[PDB]
Structure formats: structure tokens, C-alpha cells
Amino acid sequence: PITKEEKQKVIQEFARFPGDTGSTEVQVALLTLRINRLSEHLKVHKKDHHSHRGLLMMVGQRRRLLRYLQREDPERYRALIEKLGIRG
Amino acid sequence: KRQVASGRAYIHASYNNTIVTITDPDGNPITWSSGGVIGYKGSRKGTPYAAQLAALDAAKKAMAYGMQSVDVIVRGTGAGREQAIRALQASGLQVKSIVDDTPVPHNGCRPKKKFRKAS
Amino acid sequence: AVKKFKPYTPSRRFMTVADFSEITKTEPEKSLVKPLKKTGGRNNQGRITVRFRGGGHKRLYRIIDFKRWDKVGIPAKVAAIEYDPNRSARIALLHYVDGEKRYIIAPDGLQVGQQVVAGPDAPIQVGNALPLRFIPVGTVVHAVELEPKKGAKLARAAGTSAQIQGREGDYVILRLPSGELRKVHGECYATVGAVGNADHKNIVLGKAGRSRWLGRRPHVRGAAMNPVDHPHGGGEGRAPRGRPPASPWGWQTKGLKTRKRRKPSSRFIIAR
RNA sequence: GGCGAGCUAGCCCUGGCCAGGGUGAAGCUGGGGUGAGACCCAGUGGAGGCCCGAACCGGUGGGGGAUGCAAACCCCUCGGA
RNA sequence: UGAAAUGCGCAGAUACCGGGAGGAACGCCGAUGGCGAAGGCAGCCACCUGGUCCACCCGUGACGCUGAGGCGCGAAAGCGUGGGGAGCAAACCGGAUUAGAUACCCGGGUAGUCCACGCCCUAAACGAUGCGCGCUAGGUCUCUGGGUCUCCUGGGGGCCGAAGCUA
RNA sequence: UUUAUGCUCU
Ligand SMILES: [Mg+2]
Ligand SMILES: [Mg+2]
Ligand SMILES: [Mg+2]
Ligand SMILES: [Mg+2]
Ligand SMILES: [Mg+2]
Ligand SMILES: [Mg+2]
Ligand SMILES: [Mg+2]
Ligand SMILES: [Mg+2]
Ligand SMILES: [Mg+2]
Ligand SMILES: [Mg+2]
Ligand SMILES: [Mg+2]
Ligand SMILES: [Mg+2]
Ligand SMILES: [Mg+2]
Ligand SMILES: [Mg+2]
Ligand SMILES: [Mg+2]
Ligand SMILES: [Mg+2]
Ligand SMILES: [Mg+2]
Ligand SMILES: [Mg+2]
Ligand SMILES: [Mg+2]
Ligand SMILES: [Mg+2]
Ligand SMILES: [Mg+2]
Ligand SMILES: [Mg+2]
Ligand SMILES: [Mg+2]
Ligand SMILES: [Mg+2]
Ligand SMILES: [Mg+2]
Ligand SMILES: [Mg+2]
Ligand SMILES: [Mg+2]
Ligand SMILES: [Mg+2]
Ligand SMILES: [Mg+2]
Ligand SMILES: [Mg+2]
Ligand SMILES: [Mg+2]
Ligand SMILES: [Mg+2]
Ligand SMILES: [Mg+2]
Ligand SMILES: [Mg+2]
Ligand SMILES: [Mg+2]
Ligand SMILES: [Mg+2]
Ligand SMILES: [Mg+2]
Ligand SMILES: [Mg+2]
Ligand SMILES: [Mg+2]
Ligand SMILES: [Mg+2]
Ligand SMILES: [Mg+2]
Ligand SMILES: [Mg+2]
Ligand SMILES: [Mg+2]
Ligand SMILES: [Mg+2]
Ligand SMILES: [Mg+2]
Ligand SMILES: [Mg+2]
Ligand SMILES: [Mg+2]
Ligand SMILES: [Mg+2]
Ligand SMILES: [Mg+2]
Ligand SMILES: [Mg+2]
Ligand SMILES: [Mg+2]
Ligand SMILES: [Mg+2]
Ligand SMILES: [Mg+2]
Ligand SMILES: [Mg+2]
Ligand SMILES: [Mg+2]
Ligand SMILES: [Mg+2]
Ligand SMILES: [Mg+2]
Ligand SMILES: [Mg+2]
Ligand SMILES: [Mg+2]
Ligand SMILES: [Mg+2]
Ligand SMILES: [Mg+2]
Ligand SMILES: [Mg+2]
Ligand SMILES: [Mg+2]
Ligand SMILES: [Mg+2]
Ligand SMILES: [Mg+2]
Ligand SMILES: [Mg+2]
Ligand SMILES: [Mg+2]
Ligand SMILES: [Mg+2]
């Protein structure tokens, strides 16, 4: 699983400012972490559909945010994506 | 092929019949009987009276080879159980104990349509 | 897996080929430990004694190592997995620390670059050979000896294996690929694991020629012959067998058992 | 009891041969596509008891030949290539 | 079995003991309980992983709701390729019953039931009740969190019920 | 453990 400092590492690295524990990007980035994890889990355990369900949910959520962010700030949209490697 | 005092008695009690085999201390049957050996056919054998008659013909043949004590063991429901257990005691053979070892699966093989009914 | 083809010709439509991704830098084989020239001949001294053979691709014989006690204790690295035309299984070239090279029938799982060893010692993992007596009851195994020191004979076909079922004296009880339960001497070497290339059974020759490549000439039915030739020859417009189905030489071929009755071997068997 | 596979059949060892054109499989690359895929589109590529057709191997139909050129031929036509 | 008959058995059966093989399902716990969006999920262990709730009031600052198409999942049966096959059991055979009995009862029994992979996309797939949000008495039983642990508070699962709704 | 069935319109 994603360990505490393991996710902390990410929280800090994307935080819009020392103290930011749930901005748009910190969330997007956070999701991205779990998604890529599961995505690699499902590649192995493919007949595990229930878990894949959540994946869709995590994926769908991530999209909603990014659409908001690219609506309010089309700059740190490119920035966030580029830094995460998303939208293919 | 031998005469042993201490022994062991087995009661197989099914809906259709009751059969009793009496073994040595080791389990090797010394002699046996059932509802049919008594003289009954059909469903008369599933009777508790047929069980009684049976368990006596068992014990009687056992005492022949010199049978004194047994450790009665019953397997299966049915009208044979008690009357067969009782009968034994009420003739020679002192019943040193009465164990119930009727086999039951922890949900093993699927049973026949007849014994499934519910789900 | 198994390779398939879009039907750009008939036959290519059903034709299916083996997957050769498992094959490590083969192509040129290992001229030393094998090959030898293989005397391709379809009859004995003079006459045909097995019908319908001949033709088919030329072959170099890879002289494989079917007795591993030959080098007890001496470990070795698996250098490559190779194609061997003389068997259904694949072969594994292995370099011994000795500097001695030998081929082995490649077991399922056996990865390139791993260590292998044989002897009463010998960790119970894939590729290692041991006298049967020292193998944990229940493990699957291949390339077994039938009598000690006489070389492997059993379970060598692609995908085959044998299970150690129990022990009894200086003998252990195997369940042979045929399903037969047999006692084999404990001293007989075996090697842990199934044979591999188990998809083998699933290829489809696809065409007549494909059978020609493998050296199998057309097989003709007694039904298509004349009485001179076969129990089933003659008639006058198709015909049932008109007698118990027979071989060209007269013996029945549907059920009639053929194993010699009073045979020393009989005392060590127990199945199908 | 011998003589025969210098014809013919099969097989074994070692060599040789198959003009030219057509169709364009996989794979590869790039692009689109997706959470990642399947997959789709191009281009590349050059597979096949694949196509047309000489050599070569055949012998389908017809005509001719019938004390023949010939104890199995010739012409036209046709099959594989 | 209603009673029987077919069936098995003096070629040594049933009953009993010891050894071995093999497959499937997991008794008590177990609940009128729990989890999941649904289908559905029940011995034990470990790894990988989804959803969900509570406390704190810490961060983003409407970033929400629904959702024609699309995509995914989807009991049982069924299908393809392999394997596996103990018990059970469509079909099928036999014994009974009956006017007949292609059924009901009995003895046999093959696909299938099991695993891998790939299809099929159905259902009384039922709470016959689409999803989200606010508003409108309470009583009691229960599962599971937090609590200044008689009581309060949050999320679930049941019954009885104010107001109202309903043929 | 043996039963099935009851013509047409009022
Ligand atoms: Mg009876
Ligand atoms: Mg027992
Ligand atoms: Mg000879
Ligand atoms: Mg010779
Ligand atoms: Mg000779
Ligand atoms: Mg085959
Ligand atoms: Mg043939
Ligand atoms: Mg003929
Ligand atoms: Mg001849
Ligand atoms: Mg003949
Ligand atoms: Mg004939
Ligand atoms: Mg005819
Ligand atoms: Mg001669
Ligand atoms: Mg010749
Ligand atoms: Mg030339
Ligand atoms: Mg060309
Ligand atoms: Mg590509
Ligand atoms: Mg791309
Ligand atoms: Mg080109
Ligand atoms: Mg292409
Ligand atoms: Mg061609
Ligand atoms: Mg053609
Ligand atoms: Mg043509
Ligand atoms: Mg041509
Ligand atoms: Mg032409
Ligand atoms: Mg001609
Ligand atoms: Mg002709
Ligand atoms: Mg002609
Ligand atoms: Mg002519
Ligand atoms: Mg003519
Ligand atoms: Mg003429
Ligand atoms: Mg031509
Ligand atoms: Mg008899
Ligand atoms: Mg009989
Ligand atoms: Mg006898
Ligand atoms: Mg037993
Ligand atoms: Mg629930
Ligand atoms: Mg349900
Ligand atoms: Mg969890
Ligand atoms: Mg706040
Ligand atoms: Mg603010
Ligand atoms: Mg439309
Ligand atoms: Mg699908
Ligand atoms: Mg389904
Ligand atoms: Mg199913
Ligand atoms: Mg199937
Ligand atoms: Mg099958
Ligand atoms: Mg019947
Ligand atoms: Mg009948
Ligand atoms: Mg009659
Ligand atoms: Mg009836
Ligand atoms: Mg039945
Ligand atoms: Mg049955
Ligand atoms: Mg069918
Ligand atoms: Mg639908
Ligand atoms: Mg349901
Ligand atoms: Mg309705
Ligand atoms: Mg609702
Ligand atoms: Mg809806
Ligand atoms: Mg809770
Ligand atoms: Mg509490
Ligand atoms: Mg409540
Ligand atoms: Mg109510
Ligand atoms: Mg009211
Ligand atoms: Mg009538
Ligand atoms: Mg009436
Ligand atoms: Mg009438
Ligand atoms: Mg009228």
C-alpha cells in the first residue's frame, strides 16, 4: 500500500504552499498515485473487477477536478498535467 | 477363531433397517446380525422390535465365543437405536459405555434430491 | 502461446505454429556437445518395417544428457534455451563450472541464467536432478530413469511430467504421464519440474505438406485397398469392415491387448 | 535353383533447376484511441502446398495417325509451375 | 418403499477396523447479522486491492446533481479449447405406480456441476419501489463508530407507528 | 400408495 511518508512525500511536493493539504493539484496528484498503483495491480490481477470499479471512480473524480482547474487556470493545468504525465 | 471376553458392539441404525456387529477389542467383527437375519423382509426390518430381536441374536452369538462386556457404539438415527441399545443390556453383556458416533459431514458431498429439500 | 494466420490462403486459415519467444539465442546449435550427423533412414537392413515414412527436413542430432549423476555436485549455469527438431520438448544448453557443456531437456519455468545442479544434495527446485528416493513425496518431476544408472526414459515429451506418490522399500511410487501407477527404484535419478513447451499439443499442421515436412508420408486406409493387401480391401462401392477391424497383418485393432502377459515388469505396475 | 530396380515404384547420400509480372499476411514505425488497453488509420514491409505465365513437370478435349514418324507419335487445346 | 421390485451379495456383499487415492463443499460459530452498485460474497493463512464509517474542524473554495449515446460488470443454464470428474444429475435404461405414466416414487446413469482461458448478456437480475438534496411526531429491537462512557451523538439493518399519502 | 372427468344457451 501507499505508506504514510510515501503519500506525505507527494502531498508536500505538490502543495501550493507549505501548509496546503488539499488544493486542486494536491488532490489530483494524490489520486494519480493510487490510480497508477491500482492500474499496475489490475494488470496482474485482471479478473478483479470490483477493485477496477473504484479505479473508474478515482479516474472519473480526477477528471472532474482537472476540468475545474483548466477552467479557472489554464496555466497550472498544463503545468499540473505535464508534471504528472496525464491526458493521453 | 478365538474367544475374547472384552469386546465392542456396533449399532448401525438406518430408516430401513438396524444391523449390529460385535467386534473384538480391535474392531474385527466377531459376529453380526440385523433385522433380516432375525427373519424379516421388506420394511418390517426398520422396526424397533426387529432391532431388539436383532441385537439379542448378536449378543447371544457373541457369548458363544465367550462375550462378557462391550462398549456399545451407535451410528445413525432411526427406530432401531434405543430398543437396540436397551435390548443389549437386558441380556448378559454388561454395557461399559454408550457412544454415539453417527458420521456427519461438515458440508461435504451434495446429497441426493431426496435428502436436500431446503437451500 | 501459439501463432495464428489470417486466411490469405486456405490451410493458412487453420494453420497454427509454435511460439518461439521462449527460445534464447538459438539458430546455430552447439557443435561439440552435439550435434552428430543423424542417419535418416525409414527401413531396417533392406526392407520397410514402419509404413509411410521418409522425406522431410534434414536434421542435425543434438546429443542430449539423459544421465546427470555423471556430474554429481558440479553446479552449472543455464546459458540458453534452444530449438531441437528431434523432440517435442525444447533443450537447454548449460555451461558447467567445469567448463563442460551439455544439453538438457528444458523444464517448464527453467529461466536462462539460473544455476542448476544434480545429486543427493541438490535443492528441490526446478532443473535439479536427484535420486528419486530424496525427492519430497508429491512433487512433479520429469526425465525419470526406469532402472538405476540406465538413463532417463520416462516423461520427456513436451508438457509431460510424473508425480511421486509414495514410497515402498527401495522403490517409490510414480504416477506416469500415461496415468499408470508404477514402482521405480529410489536410486533412479529424476529432475524436478514438468517438461515444458506444453502448448505443443495445440498446434495445427494446417496442410498436407506440413505433415510432409515432419517426415510423415501419406497413410492409406485398408478400406481403400484390395483383399491382397489388407483385411479391409475389396468390396464394390465402399464397405463396412465386414469383420472385426484389423491391421494389415491380420490382428484385431479395436481393444485386443498386446502387452506380453508373463513379463517380469508386471510385478512393478498398477494402472492404465 | 539362380538372373534382374541401367524401365518402373519408394526410400537413403550428394548436387542442380524454377523468365517475367501480379496480390500485399504478419511484424515494424508513426498517428489517433484509452485510466491503461483492445483497437482504428497510414506508411513500411514482403508472407503464401496465393494469382497470371515461359523454361521445366504434365496429359484435359478434339482432330490426325492405325502394315504409323512412332509396339503411346503429331497438331490444336488444356493442368501445375 | 406406502408396500415393493429392479439392483448388489456365498466369485465373501452389508456391518467393523487399518492403510491409500481422488474430487467437491465448508458443520458448530450463524443471527430475524455483516459486506457489495448489482449479479453476489461464508473453514484457515498470507500477499495484492475496492468501497465505507467515525473523531478532529486542519486544506481546496461550488470544483455540484443527473445523465440520451459510449464503456465496464452481470446468478444459473448454455458454447469453444484444454484439463478435472468423488458426490450429484437433464438426456437415456431399467423397476414400480396407472386406463396410459415419455411423470410423480425406486435402482442405474451421460453432458453438466469443478479449474484455466475466451464467449454468451438472460432472470420473479424483486423492496416487482431510478438517482441526488431539503423538509415533516415518536416507541422499541439490532449491527458498528465517537462520547465528559445510566445517557448522548453518527452511519447502517428490522418491527410498530404522528401528520400526510393510498382504490 | 388408485384416479380422471362433468355438452350448449339462461
Ligand atoms: Mg427395509
Ligand atoms: Mg468413523
Ligand atoms: Mg531384413
Ligand atoms: Mg547394412
Ligand atoms: Mg543387403
Ligand atoms: Mg495433436
Ligand atoms: Mg488415409
Ligand atoms: Mg480399390
Ligand atoms: Mg504384391
Ligand atoms: Mg485377406
Ligand atoms: Mg471388407
Ligand atoms: Mg454399395
Ligand atoms: Mg528362390
Ligand atoms: Mg532405378
Ligand atoms: Mg536453364
Ligand atoms: Mg514477385
Ligand atoms: Mg503502433
Ligand atoms: Mg500514440
Ligand atoms: Mg513495396
Ligand atoms: Mg501492415
Ligand atoms: Mg502456386
Ligand atoms: Mg490455379
Ligand atoms: Mg488458367
Ligand atoms: Mg499458372
Ligand atoms: Mg493460357
Ligand atoms: Mg492429349
Ligand atoms: Mg487419359
Ligand atoms: Mg482425350
Ligand atoms: Mg485421337
Ligand atoms: Mg482417333
Ligand atoms: Mg480411320
Ligand atoms: Mg502451360
Ligand atoms: Mg449369493
Ligand atoms: Mg441376484
Ligand atoms: Mg467359496
Ligand atoms: Mg474404511
Ligand atoms: Mg448493505
Ligand atoms: Mg440475493
Ligand atoms: Mg481496505
Ligand atoms: Mg476549515
Ligand atoms: Mg481562502
Ligand atoms: Mg441516438
Ligand atoms: Mg467485454
Ligand atoms: Mg453470465
Ligand atoms: Mg455457469
Ligand atoms: Mg465446458
Ligand atoms: Mg471438456
Ligand atoms: Mg422411467
Ligand atoms: Mg416399467
Ligand atoms: Mg391396458
Ligand atoms: Mg398424479
Ligand atoms: Mg433417479
Ligand atoms: Mg445416482
Ligand atoms: Mg450441446
Ligand atoms: Mg441489458
Ligand atoms: Mg435475485
Ligand atoms: Mg406490473
Ligand atoms: Mg430507493
Ligand atoms: Mg437511472
Ligand atoms: Mg461504523
Ligand atoms: Mg462506544
Ligand atoms: Mg436508524
Ligand atoms: Mg410499518
Ligand atoms: Mg393515520
Ligand atoms: Mg375427456
Ligand atoms: Mg359446467
Ligand atoms: Mg365432453
Ligand atoms: Mg343460445
UniProtKB/Swiss-Prot annotation, chain A:
Keyword Metal-binding attached: no
Gene3D superfamilies cross-referenced by the UniProt entry: 6.10.250.3130, S15/NS1, RNA-binding
Pfam families: Ribosomal_S15
GO molecular function terms noted in the UniProt entry: rRNA binding; structural constituent of ribosome
Cellular component terms (Gene Ontology): cytosolic small ribosomal subunit
Annotated GO biological process: translation
Signal peptide: none
SUPFAM superfamilies, alphabetized: S15/NS1 RNA-binding domain (SSF47060)
Matching SMART domains: Ribosomal_S15 (SM01387)
InterPro entries in alphabetical order: Ribosomal_uS15 (IPR000589), Ribosomal_uS15_bac-type (IPR005290), uS15_NS1_RNA-bd_sf (IPR009068)
UniProt keyword annotations, A-Z: Ribonucleoprotein, Ribosomal protein, RNA-binding, rRNA-binding
Family membership noted in the UniProt record: Belongs to the universal ribosomal protein uS15 family.
Subunit record text: Part of the 30S ribosomal subunit. Forms a bridge to the 50S subunit in the 70S ribosome, contacting the 23S rRNA.
Known role: One of the primary rRNA binding proteins, it binds directly to 16S rRNA where it helps nucleate assembly of the platform of the 30S subunit by binding and bridging several RNA helices of the 16S rRNA.
Protein name listed in UniProt: Small ribosomal subunit protein uS15
Organism classification: Bacteria, Thermotogati, Deinococcota, Deinococci, Thermales
Swiss-Prot record, chain B:
Keywords from the named record: Ribonucleoprotein, Ribosomal protein, RNA-binding, rRNA-binding
NCBIfam families registered for this protein in UniProt: PRK05309.1, uS11_bact
Basic residues composition-biased segments: 109-119
Pfam families named among the record's database cross-references: Ribosomal_S11
Region feature Disordered, mapped onto this chain: 99-119
Record-level GO BP terms: translation
Protein name, UniProt field: Small ribosomal subunit protein uS11
GO cellular component entries: ribonucleoprotein complex; ribosome
PROSITE patterns: RIBOSOMAL_S11 (PS00054)
Entries under InterPro entries matching the protein: Ribosomal_uS11 (IPR001971), Ribosomal_uS11_bac-type (IPR019981), Ribosomal_uS11_CS (IPR018102), Ribosomal_uS11_sf (IPR036967)
Role description: Located on the upper part of the platform of the 30S subunit, where it bridges several disparate RNA helices of the 16S rRNA. Forms part of the Shine-Dalgarno cleft in the 70S ribosome, where it interacts both with the Shine-Dalgarno helix and mRNA.
Family, as annotated: Belongs to the universal ribosomal protein uS11 family.
Record text on subunit structure and interactions: Part of the 30S ribosomal subunit. Interacts with proteins S7 and S18. Binds to the C-terminus of IF-3; however exactly how IF-3 interacts with the 30S subunit is unclear. May contact the C-terminus of Era.
SUPFAM superfamilies, sorted: Translational machinery components (SSF53137)
Origin: domain of life: Bacteria
GO MF assignments: rRNA binding; structural constituent of ribosome
Curated annotation (Swiss-Prot), chain C:
Extent of Basic residues compositional bias: 256-272
Compositionally biased intervals (Basic and acidic residues): 229-239
Family: Belongs to the universal ribosomal protein uL2 family.
Keyword vocabulary terms for this entry: Ribonucleoprotein, Ribosomal protein, RNA-binding, rRNA-binding
Pfam family, any one: Ribosomal_L2
Gene3D superfamilies: 2.30.30.30, Nucleic acid-binding proteins (2.40.50.140), Ribosomal protein L2, domain 3 (4.10.950.10)
Protein name: Large ribosomal subunit protein uL2
Gene responsible for this protein: rplB
GO biological process, one term: cytoplasmic translation
Keyword RNA-binding recorded: yes
